[PDB]
Symmetry: D2
Subunit: 333 residues, 4 copies
């Protein structure tokens, strides 16, 4: 099964298609479901405020997109159980709407004729993959799987390296993160998340994330040992994650940095920098996470030591490269 459907052709959904074409994947996107017309989806695919013009041709008909010459059916079923995935034989659904982030909810795609679902977000207690951290846990019998959040994909490679090298006894994370579509343009009701109701490009906005709390799904030894949250700020994409840890060994910054560099060597998912980059430098990254050695900080008083480690991440395209790596392996199991 190499035929894929995308549910939710938004920021993540459209970049999923862009990245599959970019790596010349064998995967075949045969169908897209969203809430709108092919005309609007085509316009959005062609013109991207964060990544510029689509590198391939885009046209549309009344019920399809034509992308690089190839027809993709377009459906508009707001309930996944009604998506006609069998018409073009979509077997794996990349679930990118945010409305089906649980096993019970994404089961609808299987009731609708698909064989497997890969959810682009945390989805409770199910197989949750950060590629090149725990993708070896994926199994031929898995049918509904999560890639967690962009934040998880940033935190986990760094926490895995520190865990393997030094032990993490306890830690807390703050990500300073680009705003996303769950926020608001102008002050106004946004469900029941009050902070989410506030103008996102005009505020620093505290925001919850399960990235640290649910880390045990990805690194079971760290289960319950991490907590964290986000500060959403006015950049359009490109984010950074700080982890403050008590480690299991006394370290120097050079030692921490060296251990991280070894973990990023020959690692297509986890990059390393000792350059003085800022967030816009991460936009377009092909890594899920880029550890920044320039921000490593060891605070020591007598016997006590706090270790701050920092990694950048393009919460859109970078995370998407991780989603695709996982999808390619998923599709072959």
């Amino acid at each position: 099964m190499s035929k894929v459907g995308i549910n939710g052709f938004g920021r993540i959904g459209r970049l999923v298609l862009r990245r599959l074409l970019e790596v010349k994947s064998n995967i075949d996107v045969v169908a897209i479901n969203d809430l709108t017309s092919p005309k609007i989806l085509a316009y959005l695919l062609k013109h991207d405020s964060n990544y510029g013009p689509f590198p391939w041709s885009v046209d549309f008909t009344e019920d399809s997109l034509i992308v690089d010459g190839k027809s993709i059916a377009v459906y508009a079923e707001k309930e996944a159980k009604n998506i006609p995935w069998k018409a073009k034989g979509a077997e794996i659904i990349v679930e990118c709407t945010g409305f089906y982030t649980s096993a019970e909810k994404s089961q609808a795609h299987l009731d609708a004729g698909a064989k497997k679902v890969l959810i682009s977000a945390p989805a409770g207690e199910m197989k949750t993959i950060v590629y090149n951290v725990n993708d070896d846990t994926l199994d031929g019998n898995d049918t509904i799987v999560s890639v967690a959040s962009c934040t998880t994909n940033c935190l986990a490679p760094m926490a895995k390296a520190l865990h393997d090298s030094f032990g993490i006894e306890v830690g807390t994370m703050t990500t300073i993160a680009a705003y996303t579509g769950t926020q608001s343009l102008v002050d106004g009701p946004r469900g029941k998340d009050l902070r989410a109701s506030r103008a996102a490009a005009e505020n620093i906005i505290p925001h919850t994330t399960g990235a640290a709390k649910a880390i045990g799904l990805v690194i079971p030894e760290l289960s319950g040992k991490l907590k964290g949250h986000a500060q959403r700020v006015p950049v359009k994409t490109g984010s950074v994650t700080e982890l403050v840890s008590i480690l299991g060994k006394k370290v120097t910054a050079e030692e921490v940095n060296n251990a991280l560099k070894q973990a990023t060597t020959n690692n297509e998912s986890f990059g390393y920098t000792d350059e003085e980059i800022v967030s816009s430098d991460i936009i377009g990254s092909h890594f899920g996470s880029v550890f920044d050695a320039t921000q490593t900080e060891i605070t020591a008083v007598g016997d006590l030591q706090l270790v701050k480690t920092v990694a950048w991440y393009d919460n859109e395209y970078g995370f998407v490269t991780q989603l695709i790596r996982t999808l390619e392996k998923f599709a072959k199991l």
Copy 2:
């Protein structure tokens, strides 16, 4: 005096209450309708990203707001015909949702028991008031009235002065305008306006407006003589309108400026500046429009002459002061 209900407690709707309290109006707001809980409306009223903390105490119960110790009923009826306006005696509805911009749609407020409706937007061919341009056309028989857009309230006072002093033969308008809630935070579907789908805080976005086309409802002699559009840009509020005119007589810049100054003298609605201000200086303006003599430009070749005149406006609060001026007169009639 009259009791008011507010439909749509959004950017404009909340500022309606703020301005009414600020001027210590005789009008009592007795009921609000929206789509959310009193808790969420209280949070949004108390904390404003553009105008700061609410100047009065704010609390809520399960079915009301308490503002400066006064109770305001809160309803959540998506359909205006279902709002119980009679329960608290709301006589005049300030219609601020965007979903009732016609005589026929806003009739549902009269069906539901109100006497009059003031619509905070263009609403087709009905009486359409820019205070201190044509508010004298209101009379005791009017029951559904429009104050047009923020753009009309910025265009009309300037166009009326030029018309009165020099005549306008033909003109075109461009407003460089703050983004608003009809736009998108991230690239995504926004109805059928393609350009409205693009990230508003990250782009210059061309945007249609009816202010020029429908100016004849406010200034009858200018019917058919003006066109225009908007460029929406990344400022949160505060806007400016340029009008390029062929006038009915030859003029100098000083002459235009003196004529506008006379038109703004003792004019609570229409301000004048010859200071080198920028958009943030108009935020919180108590004028619907402020003419800027520093940007007047006369381009002339032979007997041909283009006149560019420029006025600032706080599309949120400044417009609201005009809406309240009109509401205050509407209620006395």
Copy 3:
């Protein structure tokens, strides 16, 4: 008491110094301003403020002065402090807000220029350094040059002080997510030798050094050498927030931390408390130097290993300025 003040550096901080003094109807009179420009330009900037809106009093100017609320203020343009003619109008205390005299050696030039005392709006080495309502009782009559530290210090210190007093801080690290300022760059281009400072401030998250934690012992001596930290500069015009992750000297709950901080902010004009779901624009114009936010408190514990994260907002412009003015009013009366 000393009542006549001069401002050196009529910038973001210096202009708000005047605004706040008029706001609180201080007996302190600003009689002179020094900067590098014309009265016309200084009057333009005082009248029109992108962050706080129109000046609340009238503003006019002459060729050598500003006229503010009807009161004349002399304007000088001496790039070297030693040349400022402070004695013409009798300016006694200089509020030093240029960023170019951030040491005792540098700022004593104002004394050479005829002033009696200097209050520096920034860290200024190992001199007497005051965070009001943390350690202002250490000011005495012999202090002649004083620092109020940074906006970050005025945010970090009240929170750390309450933690220190209640539970002990054995070690900690701070990250402030902070509004950009004029030390950064509008477009990518050289900005001295800080590489990251060269990058477009309104288009990036930009890591940025601060001394607030490293030098906290000037304000809370028992924490000397126990804290580190840095900043992430982000695209908001003003309004900032500081997170502190601490190992405390006691096992705690979140309610227990929040209650201690609440007690420390009670009857405290410098240090506020909130349990509302606010965002940065809600702190713009704060009359506090720091506002502890109980909704962000987080206790992470594994056995006897405990990390405590406490968070406080601050308006790095106006809120800091209110602390500067508090210290100035006390300074002038010693």
Copy 4:
């Protein structure tokens, strides 16, 4: 000639090198003058907030950059007199500091041993080239020439087409333009220009431009016929120019757009779109100007007619592609 020096390695200066390399030009940049260290110039060349990572390897020594394996000398002479252009053999100086915008000032580069100078800004009464409008006026005896402003390179192509097809009797433009390094990050003195003292990313800021006033240097028949200004707004690059004209014939929108279409066909400098683009879609443009037929507007009242035509431009990269076109030709004469 084939050996270039760059004075002012800023936004334009760095992009000049980027573009020369992108088009595999035979011109080689042999030296750079600025005010800083090779390390900082290397950092800035490698990491670009608007265009992302440099596509070629960058490194430095104490006195040079190494770009794609080639060494480039780096000087830091505040005064062009002192730049040893001689040493490395720098024949043509691309003058991008803003501080030598006259034939008299750029004389210094010739005194220091350069043979020609191309100034990246208006520089008074000298040959001023918009490529594919008037680059044929260049001859082998030219030593110091200007490529005008980004605004001129946007206005001139559109004006030229209209003038050729219809005649422009008089007109005025407004560009809604990305903020640049001449503006302020926070409110504070910026020389004598009051509006330039204001926070550029938080404001709409009126701003003077000479593009229209000086158009006669590029289109001599339009001398003294145009005026205009700018509104600088909070986007980092990517701008748009509106021109309101009285034409010499009556026209329809379709007729205007087909005239512009024809003038842009096989026109490598001047592009055409009828797609609903927004400013970020122009970032990275390889045109000096892109005419947008979706924004054409004809306001007609009897014999009078105002024609609004609109063209997009990447004021950084797009303008640079025009500068390089002119340079390549300038170098061969």
